Design a protein around this ligand. Structure first.
Ligand code: 87V
Length: 109
């Protein structure tokens, strides 16, 4: 059921925003501020930017037909981090930690 799926998707994103995962989930809360120092080339490398607040708004505006469409945006957010940043950057390790939380929840639904 697509309706039951999207309510579970809202639940997964709720845990991702919770205090428990806050230590590594904070860089993915809001869209990447391209006006900040060191992020002048972000728009040149990342063509489709995605973050948790945009996903939350897209769920509320019913922009996802099913769980797979929600999952695609969550993975786009992580893939943007892996593409733009160097492999040894701290944000890449944080992305892996938050993706572990998502992948385990997304598989068990
Ligand atoms: C995903 C991501 N978030 C941030 C960030 C930086 C400062 C404050 C809030 C978010 C940077 C990146 C990145 N370098 O990819």
């Amino acid at each position: 059921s697509h309706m039951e799926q999207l309510k579970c998707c809202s639940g997964i994103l709720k845990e991702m925003f919770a205090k428990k995962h806050a230590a590594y989930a904070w860089p993915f809360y809001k869209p990447v501020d391209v006006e900040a120092l060191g992020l002048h080339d972000y728009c040149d490398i990342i063509k489709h930017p995605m973050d948790m607040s945009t996903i939350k708004s897209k769920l509320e505006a019913r922009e996802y037909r099913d769980a797979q469409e929600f999952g695609a945006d969550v993975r786009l957010m992580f893939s943007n981090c892996y593409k733009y940043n160097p492999p040894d950057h701290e944000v890449v390790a944080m992305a892996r930690k938050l993706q572990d939380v998502f992948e385990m929840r997304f598989a068990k639904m």
